Each structure stands twice: as structure tokens, then as C-alpha cells.
Amino acid sequence: ARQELSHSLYQHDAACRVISRLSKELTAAREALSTLKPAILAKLEEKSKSLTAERKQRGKNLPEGLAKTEELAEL
Amino acid sequence: ARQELSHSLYQHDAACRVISRLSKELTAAREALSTLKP
Amino acid sequence: TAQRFSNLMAPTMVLLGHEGEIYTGAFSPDGTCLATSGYDQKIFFWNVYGECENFSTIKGHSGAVMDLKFTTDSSSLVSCGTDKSVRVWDMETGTCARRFRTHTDFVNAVHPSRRGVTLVASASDDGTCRVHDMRTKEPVKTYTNRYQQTAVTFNDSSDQVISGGIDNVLKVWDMRRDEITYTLTGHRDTITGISLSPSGKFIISNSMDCTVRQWDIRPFVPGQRSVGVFAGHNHNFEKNLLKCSWSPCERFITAGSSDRFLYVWETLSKKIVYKLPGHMGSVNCTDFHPKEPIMLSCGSDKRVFLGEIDMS
Amino acid sequence: TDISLNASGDYILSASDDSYWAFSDIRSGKSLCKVSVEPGSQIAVHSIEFHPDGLIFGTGAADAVVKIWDLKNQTVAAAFPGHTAAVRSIAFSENGYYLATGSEDGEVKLWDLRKLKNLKTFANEEKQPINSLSFDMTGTFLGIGGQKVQVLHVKSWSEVVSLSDHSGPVTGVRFGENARSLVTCSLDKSLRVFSF
Amino acid sequence: VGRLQQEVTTQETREKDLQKMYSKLSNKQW
Amino acid sequence: LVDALPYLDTEYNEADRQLAMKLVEHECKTFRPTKNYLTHLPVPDYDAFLTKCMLKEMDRMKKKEEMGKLDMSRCELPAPSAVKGVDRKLWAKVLRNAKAQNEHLLMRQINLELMDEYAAESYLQRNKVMEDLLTHAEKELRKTKEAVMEVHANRKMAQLKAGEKVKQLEQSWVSMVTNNYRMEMENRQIDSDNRKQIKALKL
């Protein structure tokens, strides 16, 4: 029951985002009636894949010079 | 928990009815502008 | 127990004291008072609340009084009668502030200007529609028609005068042009009364053909101005100038009726929903209290009825 | 209210009380694109940060919604209802998958972008506002700043130390190279550095 | 209902202003 | 703000339901279940009141371990045999069990003979009370079903009574918008009076 309630509230919350977005579109449309008078993208992926790939060695091994937890406990 | 589940399901049901009704109202309002200015 | 809707002491009141046939009656815009008159010539003032006692009575008229309206600020009552005169009564003094006297034949109907300088439109059996001004002996405007005029009103801006008469069609005069700007056509018999809507967009006009017709008097209308027709009331062989009046919310319209019934109509549907017995003769006048759902009706039965309603 | 620097350093991103995010050249001031964080409404935006690979960035606002945007499409990639109060700070890990957001409600929460989900929560029971967050340059440690200074080792999600030497609210947290030093600032008119 | 009553009232004031303009204008054409 | 009125919004259809949830789908493709939605409920307390013993009884069925059962073969009394009967413990088990079972059967006989006097009545007495419970419960069922249907009626009454007033005002509003824009074109058309005034100035 607590699992299904979390999903139910999540779906209702997500629905309120749609309601809010659509309610503003309607207000702008009704306002228009009520007042009616007569390589950049490629570079980023190239750069991001470079950035996220160069990370992978650091993800496999941390620097050996990293300060220990027992040292940071004495800040 | 079952009480709150029951309320959450009917509130989500009501929320979907709004999303329907606002889409009908929004399209009708957009059709009104295209009725009047053209 | 039962539902109540007003500060009246009972959900209907019978006011006795008149002996003449009561031809007109109106509330003060502040709601404290009403004034009523007719063939008795005496104008009777009544409180709206409690014992509703006849606290004041004004004589001075010597021809029966056709119609009687309060000024918007309630400082004065304007009334006119078959003594060919228009008389304005100061409410605090109870005395004739002005006695306009330029009419040549019976004055039947009166309407004061809503704002600005106090002007009194009047219509008469001499065929003239005249607008008097408190400041001058001579009237400001005299508009002459070939046929007798027995109803008059200003528009809300007090710059068009609408007059109806024997012609059935309506001479509506615009006070900057001194011309008929348009006529309203639908009445098959004489017009017994005209009343301007609170907002001023519409008028109702009552006629001896037993219909009330609602007209749009706004400056632009793209087609015919006839908005609707109301029926159910009746005009008898007395040929009275049965009046008409608006509810202050505009959702309801009333007219006098010879069948003794107080009619109320819904403005949009033109259906009836109030048909109130209790009179014993021709109901010459009907009005709404301006703040509270109290109905006034004045009849040829020498009685004035106050009653409360469920204005929905 | 907040600004963030792209990982290459070529461009700067900014947010404001006008609810727009805007992306601009640092030198000429020309703007490539600009979109409202909540179109058709006004909501105060309190934090913004690039994901360190530079293609996406997170935004935090007074509605306590955290929105993740794709710079390629210039559109919302993800939205995270989370905290109970305005998100004064957001931090992204240079591991590319831990995310942290900090708020006036005094909680700190850890997020995983691989499933767009929460991992773990930490808080102070007095619910004092948190003004600033920072991961370390390796993303092993998370520094937290509010009314006091704290650092979390994120993989354990355990408090290592807490420090309260400032006589007023903390306004910034930063880390040195290899986590060998910690730097903080405060309304106490002082800049101070801590080390072991 | 509160939405529509405000929407109605915004037009009720708009039409009075426009009809004052029409009267002012049409009374200049005469 | 959720403002649906299902007795007034009668035009809603399953085709619109599919369309509406499609929009929520494109939302929840990005909008994620990140907040603890259950913070209004308490943290659960599945081991409250339980003893240290019963916690182990929870653990076994949480493990889906099978429940242990009593060996009831004592009632059948398995026979010994002389190749096993050399131990006193076997006979001391068997004979003492045989004595014990004789009394269980004796008490069974007394219980059955008493049961034969009184069970037929007390079962009838039980069924009468059980029928009283069921008819009381069916009385409650009927009462609550009527109460549920009244709430639907009260909702329908309130929504439709407002609904007609919505319909009247909406029809009124669109008429004014169309009329006001018409008046905008008309007022700019009457600005042709500039032509008269220029002609009147330069006759």
C-alpha cells in the first residue's frame, strides 16, 4: 500500500505540472482574446564525450595522494 | 494507507480530467483568434 | 417556521389610506421610503419598514397624478399630473421646489436625469416631449410630435430622450442633434410606459397590445434592436397607462397588468416566474425596492401592496 | 542570484529572479539562447550548476523543484520534486553521476543520474538553512555550509567533522587539490582555511 | 466561476469605454 | 489546481483520457519520483509489540521456511518389536503412551456423549447469532450504499446548479469579446472623419 501510494502521489504530482503548464497557455490565449485589437551542438558532444571519457581512468582509480579520512578528521 | 491511496487515485483521476478539459478550452480559444483576425 | 427574505414585518403588507385610484408608485433610491399617488392627487409617503406608517402626505396637486419618480440623490421627488404641470417636491421641506407650467395639455410621464444637472424629461397629450431645467422658467428642449406622447425616459448619460406615444413607434431624440436618431418598431398599440435599465443598456416598453418589448439603446447594435417580447399581462378597456420597472440586478422585469396579477419576467428567457395575486383591480404600477427583494405594486383597487420575493 | 561556469571555460550560464536562464559569451556579451525556467510564470531561481561534462545543467528554485536541462535541445531533460523549501544550492559530482541539492529546510539529499533517483538523505534536526554546497575536485567528499561547516565523505554518507567557528551564516564552500585543504567564508567578515 | 466573473467584468468595462468612443466619434461625424 | 467537475464536464471521453495521460507520460519521462511523498504518514513499525520469540517466527515466514508440525503418530501408537524391545526405554515409552491414549479416548467418549446432548442446540444457537450478525451487517451495507449514492447526488446537484450558471456566463462572455473587437474595427472606421475634416479644412 505504501509503495502504491508513493506511485499514485507521484503520478498526481506529475499531473499537476501538466495542469499548470496548460492553465497558463489557456490564460495567455484568453488574454489575447480579451485584449484583441486590429557545429555548436556537435562540439558539445565531442567535448562532453571527451570530458566524460577522460574521467573513466579517474573513476577506476582515485589519486594515490588523496587525503585520508583519518587526516580530514583532524582539520 | 489504503484511505490515502483511495484519495490519491481519485485526485489523479480528477487531475487527468483537468488536462483533458484545459486542452479543449485552449484549442477552442486558439480557434477563436483564428476565427476573428483572419 | 418559514423562509424570510427582507426586513419587512410580514412577507406581505396591505397599505390602506388612499381613496383615489392609485396610478403610480416608486421607492426612494435609499430604500427608506416609498411614495404613491393617483386620482386622489394627494401624494402619500410610506416607510418601507416596521409599521410602514404614512409619515407624510403632500397635497398641492389639483389634477390627478400620472407618474412620480425620485431624483437619484433622493433630495427631491418629481411628479406630474393632469393639471398640465410638472411639480418637484423637496423631500426635507415637503414643498414645491419648482412648478413647471409650459405644457398645454395633460402631462403623463416623468423621468429625472441620473447625474449632472437635474433635468426632468416629460411627455404630454399636447404631443411635445419637453426637458425642463431646475434653473430656468423656460424649458431647455421642446420636441414636438404630431401625436400625443405618454411615456418618457432619458438614457443613462442623460443626452438622449426616449418618448413613446399614440404612434406605437417611438420618437427617440438626441439632445445634441434635436433630431430623431432612430425609431423602435414593434408595438402594435400605444405605449403605456418606458423604464430605463439600471445600467442604461436597455429599455423595456409596455404597450396596450399586452406585450412588453425589450430594446437595446446602446450606441452600436449591428441589427434589429428588439431583444425580446414578454407576454402574459393584459390591458383592459380602462386603457390605463400601466407602467413598467426594472429590477436593480436587471435579471427581472415587471409591468402593470389589468388582470390584477403582479407579473415578473426573467430577462433572457422571457418566461414568467412570479404571478402574484392579491389585488382586486388593475395594477397600474409596479417597482422593485433598490436594495432588498421587496415588490411594490399600486392598483386601481385603492390599495398598495408590499411583499418580499425570492429574487434568484 | 546564481551563475555557473562551463567546463571548457568558454561560456557562462546565469539565473535570476526573472526566472530566465540565459547562456552567454563571457567576452562579447552576446547570448546564444534564453528560455524561462517556468514559462508563463514567475518563480525565483536560487541555484544553478552545470553537470561537469557540460552538456546538461541543474536548476533550483523557490518552488523547491529541481529541473535538469539539456543544452543540446535547450529543454528540460529531468525534473526532481525533492526538498520542502527553496533550493539555495546545487552541486554536481565530477564522477558524473552523484548530484546534491541544498535548501532552507536543512536537509541534504544525494541523487543518481543513472536512474534519476535519490540515493540517501542527511539533515540537521534544527532545520537551519543550508546556504552552500560543494563536492571536492575528485567527488569523494561533499562540503556543506549553513550556520556551521560540515564535510561528508559521500561514498559512506557519514559526517566526518563539523565546525562552528564562524559567528554567522556561511556563504561559500570550496575544496583544494586532492582534498588537502578546505576553504570557507562567512558573514563574520573573515576568510579562513582549514587543514590537518 | 470566479475566473469567468472577472473575465466578464473585464469586458463589461471594456465595452463601456468603446461605446463612449463610438458616441464621441459618431457624434463628430454628424 | 485540480478543478475538474465530473458531473459538468460530461464531454470527457476515453479518447480524451488516452490523450491526457499521453501528456502526463511526456511529463513523467522527465518528471521523476524524487521527493518522499509519504512524509505525512509515519515511518512503519512492523516489529512493534513483538517478543524476541515472535521475531524469529516472523523471520522464518519472511524466509518462507515451512512451519514445524507436531508428530501426531502417538495416537496410532506404532508397535515395538522384540529385536528393538531389548531396551527398557522403548517399552517405557510405548506402555506409558498406551496408558495415556486410553484416557484421551476415555475423555473423548465423555465429550462426545455430552456433545450428543447439547451440540445440536448450541450449533442452532450459534447459527441464530450468526444470522443476526449477517442481517445487521446487511442493514449496514444498505445504509452505507444509500449514503454513498447521496454524496453522488449532492455533488451532481451542486455541480449542475453551478454548471448552468457557467454555461450562461460563458455564452455571454464570447458574445462580448466578438462584439468588442467589432467595435474596435468600427471606431477605427469612423476615424474616416479625418477625411471630412481635411476636406472641411481645405474646401
Side-chain angles (χ1 to χ4, degrees):
Chain A
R2 286 177 70 115
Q3 179 170 352
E4 290 192 331
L5 177 58
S6 301
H7 183 74
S8 184
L9 290 168
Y10 164 57
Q11 292 291 296
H12 173 258
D13 192 6
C16 293
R17 309 304 158 171
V18 182
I19 289 170
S20 182
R21 187 163 62 241
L22 291 174
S23 182
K24 289 177 284 177
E25 287 195 59
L26 174 61
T27 299
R30 287 204 171 216
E31 180 79 328
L33 285 165
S34 298
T35 61
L36 182 63
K37 290 186 175 184
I40 298 175
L41 308 183
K43 180 174 173 178
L44 288 172
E45 279 273 27
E46 183 171 34
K47 188 60 176 181
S48 174
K49 283 172 162 56
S50 193
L51 289 166
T52 305
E54 293 161 51
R55 179 180 297 122
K56 290 179 177 181
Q57 181 170 345
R58 316 185 312 210
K60 288 181 177 184
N61 296 81
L62 297 174
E64 296 189 332
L66 176 60
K68 297 179 181 180
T69 308
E70 298 93 326
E71 292 175 308
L72 200 147
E74 299 201 325
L75 283 180
Chain B
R2 285 169 66 172
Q3 175 55 223
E4 299 308 324
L5 176 62
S6 184
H7 193 65
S8 182
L9 289 169
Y10 284 122
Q11 288 277 60
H12 173 260
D13 184 68
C16 294
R17 295 184 82 125
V18 180
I19 292 167
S20 171
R21 201 199 74 245
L22 293 178
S23 304
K24 298 291 188 284
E25 290 188 72
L26 175 57
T27 50
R30 286 178 172 154
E31 286 178 13
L33 287 166
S34 69
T35 299
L36 298 180
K37 180 166 281 272
Chain C
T1 193
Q3 187 63 50
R4 290 300 308 283
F5 307 94
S6 81
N7 295 341
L8 288 174
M9 187 160 70
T12 283
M13 308 298 292
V14 183
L15 278 53
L16 303 176
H18 280 284
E19 180 176 351
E21 302 164 23
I22 313 174
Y23 287 12
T24 185
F27 290 100
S28 62
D30 65 6
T32 61
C33 161
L34 63 144
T36 60
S37 195
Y39 203 83
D40 45 21
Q41 299 166 3
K42 299 185 179 178
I43 300 171
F44 278 57
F45 296 82
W46 315 81
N47 282 328
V48 178
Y49 303 114
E51 184 59 20
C52 303
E53 64 283 345
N54 179 221
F55 69 89
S56 180
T57 295
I58 285 180
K59 299 178 179 175
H61 273 290
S62 64
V65 182
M66 307 302 286
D67 196 5
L68 172 151
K69 296 300 200 309
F70 282 84
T71 54
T72 312
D73 58 12
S74 197
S75 62
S76 299
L77 182 80
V78 187
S79 70
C80 71
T82 60
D83 55 17
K84 308 186 177 190
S85 301
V86 186
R87 285 169 157 273
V88 186
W89 311 101
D90 182 275
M91 283 295 299
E92 279 69 51
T93 318
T95 200
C96 199
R98 287 291 283 107
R99 179 182 173 182
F100 309 110
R101 63 175 70 94
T102 56
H103 278 293
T104 65
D105 212 343
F106 299 162
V107 190
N108 56 197
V110 74
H111 186 255
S113 58
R114 281 185 169 187
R115 68 188 72 88
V117 292
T118 297
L119 302 175
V120 175
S122 62
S124 170
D125 303 334
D126 58 21
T128 73
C129 184
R130 280 179 155 120
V131 178
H132 308 282
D133 181 349
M134 301 297 288
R135 301 174 296 174
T136 57
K137 290 187 180 182
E138 194 71 5
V140 186
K141 299 299 187 175
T142 297
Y143 300 129
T144 58
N145 189 49
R146 181 173 167 185
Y147 312 122
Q148 296 95 315
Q149 301 292 275
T150 65
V152 73
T153 184
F154 289 113
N155 66 342
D156 175 81
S157 50
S158 307
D159 69 327
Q160 296 194 112
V161 194
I162 301 100
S163 72
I166 284 187
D167 353 40
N168 334 307
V169 189
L170 297 80
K171 318 296 177 167
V172 181
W173 303 90
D174 186 357
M175 293 174 60
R176 68 190 54 79
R177 305 186 196 213
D178 299 328
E179 292 187 314
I180 295 175
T181 47
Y182 55 87
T183 63
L184 305 160
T185 57
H187 290 291
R188 277 71 161 191
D189 209 357
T190 88
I191 294 147
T192 63
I194 300 166
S195 184
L196 179 71
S197 55
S199 66
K201 302 183 195 190
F202 312 108
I203 64 180
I204 51 181
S205 57
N206 192 5
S207 169
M208 300 198 169
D209 73 2
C210 310
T211 69
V212 195
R213 300 184 195 264
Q214 178 187 353
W215 306 98
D216 196 346
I217 65 152
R218 290 180 286 187
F220 179 76
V221 178
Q224 193 178 24
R225 290 181 177 268
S226 184
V227 182
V229 182
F230 308 83
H233 71 275
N234 205 41
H235 294 60
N236 67 182
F237 52 81
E238 312 187 342
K239 284 189 183 286
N240 294 347
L241 309 183
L242 308 186
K243 308 303 180 190
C244 55
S245 189
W246 292 85
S247 176
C249 69
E250 281 185 21
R251 295 192 294 280
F252 307 103
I253 281 158
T254 54
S257 189
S258 295
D259 65 0
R260 310 172 173 210
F261 297 113
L262 311 184
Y263 282 90
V264 181
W265 302 264
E266 180 178 45
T267 303
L268 184 61
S269 69
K270 298 154 287 184
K271 295 179 182 180
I272 300 144
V273 57
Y274 238 108
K275 196 172 167 188
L276 245 171
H279 279 285
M280 296 170 287
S282 293
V283 182
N284 297 312
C285 189
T286 292
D287 202 11
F288 292 88
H289 184 283
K291 296 177 174 178
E292 200 163 15
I294 299 168
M295 278 258 61
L296 166 61
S297 61
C298 298
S300 189
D301 53 3
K302 313 177 171 71
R303 297 195 176 190
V304 179
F305 276 73
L306 293 171
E308 66 180 41
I309 59 173
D310 182 25
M311 295 201 300
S312 64
Chain D
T1 56
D2 196 13
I3 62 173
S4 185
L5 189 74
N6 194 257
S8 68
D10 297 317
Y11 302 105
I12 189 80
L13 173 69
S14 66
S16 171
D17 283 354
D18 65 15
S19 309
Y20 291 88
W21 66 258
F23 182 59
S24 310
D25 178 24
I26 297 160
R27 191 174 181 181
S28 68
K30 296 180 179 181
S31 301
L32 294 175
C33 54
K34 169 176 175 180
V35 189
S36 180
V37 173
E38 183 56 40
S41 188
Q42 285 292 340
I43 301 182
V45 183
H46 289 284
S47 52
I48 192 162
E49 183 161 295
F50 279 109
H51 182 289
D53 74 40
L55 244 178
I56 72 175
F57 57 92
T59 54
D63 65 355
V65 179
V66 170
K67 301 188 185 180
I68 313 302
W69 293 79
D70 169 33
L71 187 58
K72 191 184 181 184
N73 290 274
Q74 307 172 8
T75 55
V76 179
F80 302 146
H83 287 278
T84 63
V87 181
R88 287 188 178 192
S89 191
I90 290 174
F92 290 81
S93 181
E94 253 282 59
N95 69 13
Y97 47 84
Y98 291 164
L99 157 68
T101 68
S103 174
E104 297 188 348
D105 66 8
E107 306 190 16
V108 181
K109 296 185 188 285
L110 187 71
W111 315 97
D112 189 350
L113 297 173
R114 297 171 297 172
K115 295 190 178 185
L116 302 173
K117 72 170 186 172
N118 190 259
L119 297 183
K120 296 184 180 178
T121 295
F122 180 81
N124 72 90
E125 298 188 332
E126 302 196 319
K127 301 185 179 179
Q128 288 149 16
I130 302 301
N131 290 337
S132 187
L133 298 176
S134 187
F135 291 103
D136 90 278
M137 191 171 70
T138 72
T140 296
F141 303 101
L142 175 63
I144 298 174
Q147 298 291 353
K148 61 178 178 180
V149 179
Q150 296 165 269
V151 180
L152 310 187
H153 177 272
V154 186
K155 186 179 180 182
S156 66
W157 195 254
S158 65
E159 185 186 68
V160 189
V161 72
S162 175
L163 301 172
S164 302
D165 297 344
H166 296 297
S167 61
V170 179
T171 58
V173 184
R174 291 294 187 267
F175 287 82
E177 184 166 35
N178 296 322
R180 297 185 178 189
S181 63
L182 176 72
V183 184
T184 66
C185 64
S186 171
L187 300 183
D188 68 357
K189 307 173 291 183
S190 79
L191 168 66
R192 312 194 205 181
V193 186
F194 312 103
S195 69
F196 42 81
Chain E
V1 175
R3 178 190 70 151
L4 288 168
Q5 285 189 338
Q6 288 177 222
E7 285 178 9
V8 162
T9 304
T10 302
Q11 303 308 307
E12 291 253 44
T13 60
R14 188 187 180 198
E15 79 159 303
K16 295 183 184 83
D17 191 27
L18 292 184
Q19 285 155 28
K20 283 171 180 179
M21 278 300 298
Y22 185 91
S23 55
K24 184 179 182 288
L25 288 170
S26 57
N27 295 338
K28 177 63 177 180
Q29 188 180 22
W30 179 86
Chain F
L1 184 65
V2 175
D3 59 15
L5 299 175
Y7 293 108
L8 176 58
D9 304 331
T10 59
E11 186 267 350
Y12 178 84
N13 182 267
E14 188 268 354
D16 307 304
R17 189 175 199 85
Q18 179 68 1
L19 179 59
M21 292 181 69
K22 184 275 196 185
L23 290 167
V24 181
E25 186 197 313
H26 281 26
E27 181 66 25
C28 76
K29 202 162 293 186
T30 69
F31 192 90
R32 292 286 172 167
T34 37
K35 61 177 284 182
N36 186 358
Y37 288 105
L38 305 183
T39 54
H40 62 292
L41 303 185
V43 63
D45 56 349
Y46 313 102
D47 306 322
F49 294 95
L50 299 190
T51 70
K52 181 260 188 173
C53 173
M54 188 52 57
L55 260 296
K56 294 187 175 184
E57 262 53 291
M58 294 285 155
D59 284 342
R60 64 173 76 252
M61 55 193 171
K62 194 265 182 179
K63 193 178 293 185
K64 201 58 175 69
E65 179 61 291
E66 184 60 293
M67 302 298 96
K69 296 296 191 184
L70 291 176
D71 46 322
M72 292 295 180
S73 61
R74 292 186 180 173
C75 300
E76 281 71 48
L77 186 68
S81 65
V83 300
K84 305 303 179 70
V86 295
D87 185 2
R88 307 287 64 63
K89 190 171 61 180
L90 180 59
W91 300 105
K93 185 183 294 185
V94 168
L95 272 65
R96 292 189 303 154
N97 187 24
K99 293 181 182 184
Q101 295 308 318
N102 269 281
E103 279 289 298
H104 287 301
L105 290 167
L106 177 61
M107 291 295 292
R108 185 181 180 186
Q109 286 182 355
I110 297 166
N111 285 337
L112 289 164
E113 285 170 12
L114 291 159
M115 193 177 197
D116 199 18
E117 299 202 86
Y118 305 124
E121 186 278 325
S122 62
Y123 279 35
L124 179 60
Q125 192 186 137
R126 183 187 66 184
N127 291 10
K128 194 194 302 183
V129 174
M130 187 62 186
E131 288 271 27
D132 186 34
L133 291 174
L134 182 61
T135 52
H136 181 205
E138 286 188 343
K139 179 175 181 278
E140 186 64 25
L141 178 57
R142 183 176 63 81
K143 168 271 203 170
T144 189
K145 288 280 183 174
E146 288 179 22
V148 168
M149 195 63 190
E150 193 213 312
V151 173
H152 286 68
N154 294 339
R155 284 173 62 224
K156 187 174 68 172
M157 180 57 64
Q159 290 179 33
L160 293 178
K161 185 171 183 286
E164 302 308 325
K165 290 188 174 184
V166 165
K167 288 161 61 189
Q168 287 167 10
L169 292 166
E170 173 71 357
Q171 183 175 9
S172 183
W173 183 79
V174 298
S175 81
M176 287 191 290
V177 169
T178 55
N179 188 46
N180 278 266
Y181 176 64
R182 177 61 184 276
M183 290 189 292
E184 298 276 11
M185 294 188 291
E186 291 290 342
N187 291 345
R188 291 176 74 259
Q189 181 167 357
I190 301 160
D191 282 335
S192 302
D193 285 349
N194 283 280
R195 196 185 298 129
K196 301 295 188 70
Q197 188 152 285
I198 291 294
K199 180 58 177 176
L201 183 62
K202 295 297 198 294
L203 186 64

